Design a protein around this ligand. Structure first.
Ligand SMILES: *[C@@H]1O[C@H](CO)[C@@H](O[C@@H]2O[C@H](CO)[C@@H](O[C@@H]3O[C@H](CO)[C@@H](O)[C@H](O)[C@@H]3O)[C@H](O)[C@H]2NC(C)=O)[C@H](O)[C@H]1NC(C)=O
Ligand code: CHT
Length: 493
């Protein structure tokens, strides 16, 4: 087990690194490579393992696999709406507009939650990589994720002293070659039948009841409008040369990620349609055994022959471990540059960049490892990433950019209001019992209250209206008498 798995992973990762450095070593297609790399930024660890877990779990089903359909629509909306009002004014990055208007220091306050979201995303990628490595070499869960994160961070440290194209071909081959003949054991039932009638378990095409349609709408408008303000997307859009180039790139990336989500949904459907008693996985199912994150690696390993399995599985592991470096490097470099050019100053010649980036990558590897080492989900961390980005970035990025009005006062007021209406609202994925108990609450199996009434969307709306109202009242009273203009720290007058 151990030796063959290590051989496969080492061989395939060495090959992909050689191919990448060779392509870097030395027309009518240019958009397609850009589309592939931009959809390579989203895919990797997030979709495949995450959406496999979302489909497989009895209770979620496909109807609650909110992410893969959420983020393609996120790209479409972001391109079609924000692609135009991002060129004429002139924006180096998405961090620049916040520092341009809200004095400059408030950018760090606004990008501590985006940093937290990217921490969550890195934790999801690390958990996916740990799951795949643990399945392929059969050593353990907690050790595997720590080792994988250590390798990823060490590779980040010296990896800077085109790859993304080969990375997606690795995923596309690895999955689509392993499930034209995977649903062929005497165990796997008809993928069409277990969608609507339930052989081994409750149907993988999950059902949403009329009582909790509001939760669906909220948790789907969350993903749609929280996948847009991410740093990687706006870093790729602004470097695009032509105006319509950004729109075309976003549309092709959305189509690519929709096509890429197909091989992973069927994997979850197979996993939910098997008979985990005639295979080699023993009597317990991966549902009454908290290993629902490994559904995709388990179906790839056990429901495929020896030679077909490890090719695709090693390809998937290599692709996700490749994406880990991009995640960590962005999450460290953006923080270092923005906030240590924000706070006072630091000598950027030979000290600031080197040691602050080094300490940042070390601490972020440690934090992502600790964050993904305890939460036994791979979809939950990803969802919470998009969640917090939605709550406390999208309203302010929408009011600063789309039309007009946002002062600094409204920024802090909306920040406080949104954070309050969430942290008092309740986070079921973590062990955070709510404190307001919005009408329609139903207790969960664990013992953690979750709410049917929407409070993420309510938090977004409250933050936006708080920003607008506070800023316009500031424009009302910028004169004397009512709060004389002497008080001025961050100015709107
Ligand atoms: C998969 O599950 C099936 C049952 O759904 C298992 O098949 C049955 O397993 C039992 C226990 O090993 C075999 O012994 C039988 O036990 C009952 C208990 O009262 C006894 O009354 C019978 O006289 C018999 O001794 C049983 O023969 C077997 N049935 C068949 C048709 O093979 C099976 O072991 C599970 N695992 C697989 C298929 O890998
Ligand atoms: C929505 N995110 C950008 C956080 C991940 C896409 O997989």
């Amino acid at each position: 087990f151990h030796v063959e798995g290590l051989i496969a992973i080492i061989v395939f990762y060495l090959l992909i690194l050689l191919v990448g450095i060779w392509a870097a070593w030395r027309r009518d297609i240019g958009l397609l490579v850009g589309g592939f790399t931009m959809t390579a930024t989203w895919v990797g660890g997030g979709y495949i393992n995450g959406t496999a877990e979302a489909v497989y779990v009895p209770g979620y089903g496909l109807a609650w696999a909110q992410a893969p359909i959420g983020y393609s629509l996120s790209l479409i909306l972001g391109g079609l709406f924000f692609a135009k009002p991002m060129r004429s004014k002139g924006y180096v990055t998405m961090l620049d507009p916040f520092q341009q208007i809200y004095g400059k220091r408030m950018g760090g306050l606004l990008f501590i939650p985006a940093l937290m979201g990217e921490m969550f995303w890195a934790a999801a990628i690390f958990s996916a990589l740990g799951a795949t490595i643990s399945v392929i070499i059969d050593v353990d869960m907690h050790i595997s994720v720590i080792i994988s994160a250590l390798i990823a961070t060490l590779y980040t440290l010296v990896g800077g002293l085109y790859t993304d194209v080969v990375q997606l071909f690795c995923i596309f081959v690895g999955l689509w070659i392993s499930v034209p003949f995977a649903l062929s054991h005497p165990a796997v039932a008809d993928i069409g039948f277990t969608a609507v009638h339930a052989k081994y378990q409750k149907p993988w095409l999950g059902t949403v009841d009329s009582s909790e349609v509001y939760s669906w709408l909220d948790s789907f408008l969350l993903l749609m409008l929280g996948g847009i303000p991410w740093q990687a997307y706006f870093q790729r859009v602004l470097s695009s040369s032509s105006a319509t180039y950004a729109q075309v790139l976003s549309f092709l990336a959305a189509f690519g990620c929709l096509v890429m989500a197909i091989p992973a949904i069927l994997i979850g459907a197979i996993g939910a349609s098997t008979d985990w008693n005639q295979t080699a996985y023993g009597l317990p199912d991966p549902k009454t055994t908290e290993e629902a994150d490994m559904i995709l690696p388990i179906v790839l390993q056990y429901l495929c022959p020896v030679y077909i399995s490890f090719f695709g599985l090693g390809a998937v592991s290599a692709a996700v471990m490749s994406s880990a470096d991009s995640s960590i490097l962005s999450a460290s470099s953006m923080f270092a540059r923005n906030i240590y050019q924000l706070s006072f100053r630091q000598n950027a010649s030979d000290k600031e960049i080197v040691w602050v980036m080094r300490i940042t990558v070390f601490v972020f590897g440690a934090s992502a490892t600790a964050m993904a080492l305890l939460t036994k989900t791979v979809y939950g961390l990803w969802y919470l990433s998009s969640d917090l980005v939605y709550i406390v970035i999208f309203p302010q990025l929408l009011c600063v950019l789309f039309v007009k009005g946002t002062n600094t006062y409204g920024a802090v007021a909306g920040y406080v209001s949104g954070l309050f209406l969430r942290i008092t609202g309740g986070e079921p994925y973590l062990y955070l019992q709510p404190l307001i108990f919005y009408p329609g609450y139903y207790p969960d199996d664990n013992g953690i209250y979750n709410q049917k009434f929407p409070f993420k969307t309510l938090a977004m709306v409250t933050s936006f209206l708080t920003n607008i109202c506070i800023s316009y009242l500031a424009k009302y009273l910028f004169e004397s008498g009512t709060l004389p203009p002497k008080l001025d720290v961050f100015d709107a007058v």
